[PDB]
Design an enzyme around this catalytic site. Structure first.
Site, PDB file in Angstrom:
ATOM      1  N   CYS A 106     -69.593  47.002  75.361  1.00  0.00           N
ATOM      2  CA  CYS A 106     -68.347  47.502  75.931  1.00  0.00           C
ATOM      3  C   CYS A 106     -68.867  48.567  76.876  1.00  0.00           C
ATOM      4  O   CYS A 106     -69.106  49.702  76.460  1.00  0.00           O
ATOM      5  CB  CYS A 106     -67.444  48.158  74.889  1.00  0.00           C
ATOM      6  SG  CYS A 106     -65.987  48.971  75.641  1.00  0.00           S
ATOM      7  N   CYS A 127     -66.832  51.826  76.953  1.00  0.00           N
ATOM      8  CA  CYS A 127     -66.807  52.650  75.756  1.00  0.00           C
ATOM      9  C   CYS A 127     -67.567  52.199  74.518  1.00  0.00           C
ATOM     10  O   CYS A 127     -68.756  52.474  74.383  1.00  0.00           O
ATOM     11  CB  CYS A 127     -65.415  53.182  75.410  1.00  0.00           C
ATOM     12  SG  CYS A 127     -64.172  51.851  75.254  1.00  0.00           S
ATOM     13  N   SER A 128     -66.888  51.506  73.609  1.00  0.00           N
ATOM     14  CA  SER A 128     -67.557  51.056  72.392  1.00  0.00           C
ATOM     15  C   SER A 128     -66.782  49.955  71.693  1.00  0.00           C
ATOM     16  O   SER A 128     -67.020  49.651  70.521  1.00  0.00           O
ATOM     17  CB  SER A 128     -67.752  52.233  71.440  1.00  0.00           C
ATOM     18  OG  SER A 128     -66.517  52.868  71.148  1.00  0.00           O
ATOM     19  N   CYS A 129     -65.850  49.365  72.428  1.00  0.00           N
ATOM     20  CA  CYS A 129     -65.038  48.282  71.917  1.00  0.00           C
ATOM     21  C   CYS A 129     -65.810  47.299  71.058  1.00  0.00           C
ATOM     22  O   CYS A 129     -66.791  46.704  71.505  1.00  0.00           O
ATOM     23  CB  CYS A 129     -64.109  47.718  72.972  1.00  0.00           C
ATOM     24  SG  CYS A 129     -63.326  49.107  73.870  1.00  0.00           S
TER      25      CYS A 129
END
Ligand SMILES: OC[C@H]1O[C@@H](O)[C@H](O)[C@@H](O)[C@@H]1O
Ligand SMILES: OC[C@H]1O[C@](O)(CO)[C@@H](O)[C@@H]1O
Ligand SMILES: OC[C@H]1O[C@](O)(CO)[C@@H](O)[C@@H]1O
Ligand SMILES: OC[C@H]1O[C@](O)(CO)[C@@H](O)[C@@H]1O
Ligand SMILES: [Co+3]
Ligand SMILES: [Co+3]
Ligand SMILES: [Co+3]
Ligand SMILES: [Co+3]
Lengths: 120, 217, 156, 151, 218, 120, 153, 217, 119, 152, 216, 120
Positions: free
Chosen positions: E106, E109-111
């Protein structure tokens, strides 16, 4: 969904002015001209108009300038509370450790709302 | 050569008018009001104070009331009828004396008494001036060409809340018998900020480099 | 010589770029790498610079750009008409923009970005309407149609 | 050990990498090119494609406060204070370039949870400041602080 | 002895509860839910797909429906009953093949597919991984110890909108006659992200440095 | 002061899910699986979820994943408009100039809402 | 593609804005120098193997006439005993110091060092070098030409 | 416009000649020598080794002696008659095999086997290549478009002292019955450094950006 | 203060460098096959023994030649000559993060005798 | 005041975060070097007069025994003809280069340069210097002391 | 011990082993430095204030004037040819009602050691060396010294072989003072020029003092 | 190997001093006290003691201080040439563009060898 009231400020201040429109809303002032006060180091997350350079310093109140919501509240659209603002004079030597004794009478004057003040 | 700022300025203004936030007339009215601003009224207030001790007392105690005498009503002169949104309605006049000399700054931004003085100088808005004046005022003032006796109290006023200031300098020697017009003429914008003092024969701010705009008026 | 002095001053300014430093890039450090001192510095309100050390600079005046005068009027008109108070503007303009933009962009650049910002944050315009207006504005310029008082139309 | 000193050295010399370091102090509009305008106004979370070095990836043990912060953010969404998209925009973009990379991942999640309470006026900034003072005093007076510190 | 982060976390949580935004029970319920999450259901989904062609087709076409067979309902399993606010309800399963190998990130972000996989690794959240994987995937994978033939299509999936992904690696050699449980055992979190491939005998993620917390759960 | 509707999302999504709750609200899709599309470099001021590295590149639509408000609107509380989202596959060589011909088949797949797409 | 070119310029430009804790060093006291810093400051600049760096799209570069002339000059000085190549490496890749080592061009260092050996071994005085540079600049400015770099006007 | 580098180059060369350090003839002779250098001899050495097992053994054990077979005598080909001052006289040939593949670098500078291979590539001299190859060779080679089985030993050779290396890649498939000329043709400079392997049909280094000089020959 | 500009040429002409130093180091202290660790000798001012090798252990695969150490040659000191060795290091022994997947990778480089101690 | 101390630490710390356009330089091509940059890179480091700098609260500093010894060594080397003070200045304040010039301490440069003249004029070989440094460290490690710095 | 102490020992032992200088030479120099201080310079100023003819000599020939306070720039140092680093050309700069001097060595730290002692840490700082020549009034103000705007402040940059000491004007309130009394208020700082003599002030203004790891 | 003469300086300067030992070696001075001179911007590669801030500026010679080899030569062991050194006074306004007219009489005095001087 939110609806913003775009007429509130104008209706309250027209023909009167700001901060005149908040006059009398703070009640009795906690301090008086001549009082020595120290600046409390209140949390400053997100916003403040009480400069870091004044935190923990002691000065003299020289004028009760007006009443107004604190900027910390006004800046976020919260004007329900109104407090006294004070003009305070600090000796430069009390702010800056390196200030020369040669210029012993130099000062700095600025305004601070009541919430930051405590009797020295 | 149209810049990203010009594209965005136009976008914001058109959207605000399209959404009815403010009118095309409001915008013209504000620009025209700003065009009428300048240092002349403040200079006149200082000259009048020098020429009338009783008016000087009023200036020192109630700048807002005193300002009315030079045609600047902080509440009703602006288009809002409640003072300008950003300069508010609490002007204070700082009176210099043989033992006190003031200089003003807004360390948090650029707060300036626009209604009576006009727009702020580019340098007044600089992070540099805002960082240094409150701590090294004698050094900064010397850079501007101003030096005061070491025993004189230099007071830096930081315009951080709703009060705006103008400095009333001490009347210089060599002006005996001068008229209000003659005196007002030597009280420049710089004298009203406090980075310079009035001098007979000097009627303009000290020359400094001028950075040109890509597209001025 | 004026040309020699100009080169001398350009030199004094250029060597500043080469001032040695211990340059520590920060790439999302763990909580264990954040001291209270660093926490206070990172969560500082950007506009509070009084007392910070800085060098002497030869102060200059600057001519006003037409777009700056228009931006100023727009910000005061938005306040006059209740979209925001000046304090809300200052908080968004001088603080919310963050450290980098606060000192990397121009004074009025921040005023303008923030005027656009209040329109979107208070939902008077959608971000889509703002993006679309910018696209359309650029087209105006590129086409030769002109852009208000900033650029006249190309003619015959 | 010698190898430990070698690796500390390899990391340390990076601090001394020469550069033309140009401090920016509110430059005039004439000093902002379109290239710089785009770079300053981009949203900081958009880093894909940027050059970076190889780093020996590590796992990280979870802080109790990180677990609580994550739960708080999802609960605020569950109960309608915000949608996750509003959180991302505020948390990974609105924080600005400096805080975006200078502070920790969950530090931003937490600051933003505080931020939504104030921006949507569920609490005034004064109430938040007062609450911070309260937590500090609770700790200073030996009253403990949740599961972080017993009385 | 308590950090600025702990002081602020407490302030925010107490304020939120005082104002009736969410309750202490809501917070406890969410923490417990997250505590139950892990890669086991995803690993089981992959093993089932290896053993059942029809289920594999379902995994590839409709990950949300396929997830139900391993007990994770993206809409109803989370406390909200409308999917987690941050992971949404559109799981897609990416099937590797002899000519295709996937890896996920991601970049914004960090999805991560938390409902079926658990919390994201610290490195998955790093600006470094988010900058490099989409551009130098073979170099990054090599650092992780994974290399694929040059002719094989390495596909990087950037989880930027509402879709979350899990990688269904190809079944490795040396697993003839293995049961679903035996197969699921070698499909680690890293295999589901795509930085590793399943190997007989390997049942845990490759060992890597672990940065300790100041105050982890006791 | 403005009032925030804290029940809207849950009332709309409970028992359905997100983005399932927006199904059918986008109308007919402008593009279909197999179509080649170029990514428009729309302004990214304040927010965008269409990575800069994809701007101006051409890819192939491999799936119409779901319907949903664009993040550019959802992130500011604007959900009145719903559009189709597409999963697009880009050849790595079309994104990175330096990508090696040795790895000729490598790709990158990501999702982009309809507003950013134009027929290649 | 004009857009792709802008995208790539952007990816390169944002690197300039990478946040950092930037500590200027202004002749710190001995108490501020740890062993780790002492070893880093007294390092031999050319020893970079193992240092972290990013991937760059490697390029070839056309040779400047002055680079070819500099290379020949350096080898000729060695051929004729003014120095050995090892003496050159030490002066060129190490003695120049960290800043010049990475701030200036590869052959720029080769050339500066060729000038340097002439002065350090007293084959020419620094004054002769300074004077020669002045004369060369005047030669160019007068229209007299400069070897194969500029024909007489 | 002539650069500061061109001015200094002339100054240094003129002073050196005026002081009798080296002659104008010496400089011409060296430039002429450099102009004759290139990768062709090294490529011929590899082709000859592929076609003669005994010569291949010689290449591996004594590169200096093997080099003579392709017209490059490390001691006597250079003008000095004692080898070039900077490349010395100890060439070693590294033989790749189905289980070993070499790649070369000079982390300390740019050390390269100039007498038999020509001048070094700009990228070979880069701090980047010099920092990364010894630690992340698989990744750097992949960037160059080269990948090897994970079980194969990739050996990075760091030319830090007086030895210079050339890589003898394994002979690729698809070259049955090829002549020495045909085989030498696919052994490019990059193959001899180790960032590429020979391939039938490929007779030039992989195309990459070329930075232009301000004033090339 | 005069510099001898004919010494090197007189010694190496028709012979080569490092061939001109052959036999000057005497008996080699180590042999092909020996395991040696690299001593972290002071590196002030100059060294050609990379920091990345300090403290690491490798295998000698060849006694390449004899020559003054660069640390001496670079300062005009050629009175002492020593043996130079080509050493092979396992990548995992140099870089902590090296992947087990590439377990056979190595690095070969040359180091003069003064930096070696039997492992 | 603990609060004032925190205030001043804060004012110093935010300086580390001052935004800048930080351009790392990795051996740029000649075409990337302007005359302005050429003059700046080839500058003599010790020539700083006129450069902008900030106000600092000047301090006195107690002398280290090793600094007093370094000073004496440098003057003795000159007294006895190893070098003249001008040769020392050129080597110490200029040849050390920009980074070391401002990154290391004043007397650190004096000392490094004293070691340097011994090697550059071949009074000692670099090997003798390296060996001596090893000897000093071993003397300390073995408990035999180090001059007036550490007793046995 | 630090890396600096290790290297200092190494350099000194090698220099002595190679016969560059002896252990006795090193002790002789340290002993000489120990005899140095600001008193001779202060006495020169006091004598000049009391003797117009001597003051003229100070201004025209500092080297000859220095002999009166026992500091012969050529023969006092162990070398008998002046110190290698301070040389033999002292110049005395005389302040007046219209002129006030302050000294710096922008290139390094050049200071009149034979007659004044060792230089202050701040005098050697890049900061003082960068700023004084350009913003002298601002730097002096930081030091607590201000002069009328019409007075000529002259900054002397000690870049070649000349070393300077400042002869401040004699302050008010010292009528009938003896040479000793006058010399006592001419501090090191007054001789550098960052301060002026004042009755009752006999030591440099107090400043922060950074401690050494291992001082004497 | 080169041999360094470590007795030359002491033999030449003992009992005389430096720069007294170079007295009379420069011959007749090119300039006199009172002359206005401009500082030539000579190349500064490797070493110089004529500060960059003085290049191109004009000052007044106030004293012929002594004769000595230029530092540019002395610092590299070359003392064969000796030249006159001059103390020069510059008006601060001629060095720094920003210098204030208020401090109209401020100056800077420093020494420069003859090679850098040219009649103004
Ligand atoms: O169907 C939804 C239910 O699924 C169960 O597996 C969970 O334990 C419940 O908490 C949840 O409400
Ligand atoms: O013009 C830029 C200004 O800053 C300097 O380059 C460096 O301090 C000055 O000399 C010049 O006046
Ligand atoms: O020059 C900076 C580097 O980043 C890009 O601009 C964008 O990815 C590249 O093409 C270039 O190699
Ligand atoms: O030789 C000239 C010299 O003599 C004096 O006028 C008198 O001693 C000195 O100040 C000057 O240096
Ligand atoms: Co302001
Ligand atoms: Co994410
Ligand atoms: Co090399
Ligand atoms: Co000096």
């Amino acid at each position: 969904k939110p609806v913003w009231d775009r007429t509130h400020h104008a209706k309250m201040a027209t023909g009167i002015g700001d901060p005149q429109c908040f006059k009398g809303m703070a009640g009795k002032s906690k301090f008086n001209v001549g009082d020595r006060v120290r600046i409390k180091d209140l949390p400053d997350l997100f916003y403040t108009r009480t400069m870091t350079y004044t935190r923990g310093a002691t000065g003299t109140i020289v004028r009760l300038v007006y009443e107004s919501p604190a900027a910390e509240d006004e800046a976020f659209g919260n004007e329900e509370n109104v407090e006294w603002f004070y003009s305070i004079v600090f000796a430069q030597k009390d702010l800056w450790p390196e200030y020369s004794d040669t210029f012993a009478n130099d000062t700095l004057e600025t305004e601070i709302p009541e919430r930051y003040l405590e009797k020295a | 050569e149209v810049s990203d700022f010009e594209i965005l300025e136009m976008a914001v203004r058109e959207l605000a008018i399209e959404k009815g936030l403010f009118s095309a007339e409001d915008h013209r009215v504000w620009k025209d009001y700003v065009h009428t601003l300048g240092p002349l009224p403040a200079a006149r207030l200082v000259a009048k104070a020098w020429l009338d001790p009783e008016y000087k007392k009023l200036c020192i105690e109630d700048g807002v009331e005193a300002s009315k005498a030079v045609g600047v009503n902080w509440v009703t002169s602006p288009p809002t009828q409640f003072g300008t949104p950003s300069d508010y309605c609490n002007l204070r006049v700082l009176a210099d004396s043989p033992t006190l000399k003031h200089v003003v700054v807004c360390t948090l931004c650029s707060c300036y008494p626009r209604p009576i003085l006009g727009q702020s100088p580019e340098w007044y808005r600089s992070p540099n001036y805002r960082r240094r004046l409150v701590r090294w005022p004698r050094q900064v003032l010397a850079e501007f060409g101003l030096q005061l006796p070491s025993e004189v109290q230099i007071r830096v006023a930081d315009s951080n809340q709703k009060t705006r200031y103008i400095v009333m300098p001490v009347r210089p020697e060599g002006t005996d018998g001068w008229t209000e017009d003659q005196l007002a003429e030597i009280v420049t914008r710089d004298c009203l900020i406090g980075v310079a003092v009035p001098k007979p024969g000097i009627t303009v701010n000290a020359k400094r480099p001028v950075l040109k705009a890509n597209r001025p008026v | 010589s004026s040309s020699i002095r100009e080169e001398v001053h350009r030199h004094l300014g250029t060597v500043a770029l080469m001032q040695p430093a211990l340059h520590q890039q920060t790439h999302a450090p763990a909580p264990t790498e954040i001291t209270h001192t660093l926490f206070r510095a990172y969560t500082r309100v950007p506009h509070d610079v009084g007392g910070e050390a800085d060098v002497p600079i030869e102060y200059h005046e600057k001519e006003e750009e037409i777009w700056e005068l228009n931006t100023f009027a727009t910000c005061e008109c938005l306040a006059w008409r209740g979209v925001w108070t000046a304090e809300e503007r200052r908080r968004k303009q001088n603080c919310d923009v963050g450290q980098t933009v606060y000192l990397g962009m121009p004074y009025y650049g921040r005023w303008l970005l923030t005027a656009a910002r209040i329109l979107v944050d208070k939902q008077f315009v959608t971000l889509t309407e703002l993006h679309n207006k910018i696209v359309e504005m650029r087209e105006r310029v590129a086409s030769g149609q002109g852009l208000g008082e900033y650029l006249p139309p190309k003619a015959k």
